[PDB]
Amino acid sequence: SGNYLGVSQNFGRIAPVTGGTAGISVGVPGYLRTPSSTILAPSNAQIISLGLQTTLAPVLSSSGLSSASASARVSSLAQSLASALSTSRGTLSLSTFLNLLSSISSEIRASTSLDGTQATVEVLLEALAALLQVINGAQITDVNVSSVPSVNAALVSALVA
What we know:
The protein is mainly alpha-helical and 161 residues long.
C-alpha cells in the first residue's frame, strides 16, 4: 500500500505500516544475506574493506617495514575467517579474487618484484598464516588458496624464478 501523506491529512499518527513481502524469498536470502535490506548495502565499501584494510595496514602500522608487511597479509587472513563468521564463508570469487591477490602482493611489495630472499622465509610464514587463519575458528572448508595466483605461488616463484 501507500503511506505517502497517508492519502489523508490525519497521517501524522500513522507510521510507515508498509513493506514485508520480499518476493519469492520471505526472510530467506541464504545466497546473498547482505547485512542490510538494501540490495548491495556494502556499496563498494565493506566489500572493498577486504582491500582497504591491507592497503592501509602499512600506512597505519608506521610504514611497510619487516613487521607491518606481514601484519597486512595476516590481517586479511584474520578478516577472511571473521567475514566467514558474518554473511560470507571466507570467499568472494574464483577469477576476480586473483585480480585482488595480484594487487595485494604489489601494494605491500613483498611476494612480488623485490621477492627473492625474504620471500623464501615468507613461504613458511604464510604457510603458517594459512594454518593460523583456520586455528582462529575453522569453519571446516574455510581456507581458500585459489589455483596459483593467491599471493602464495609468488613466494615460490621468488626463490625458483
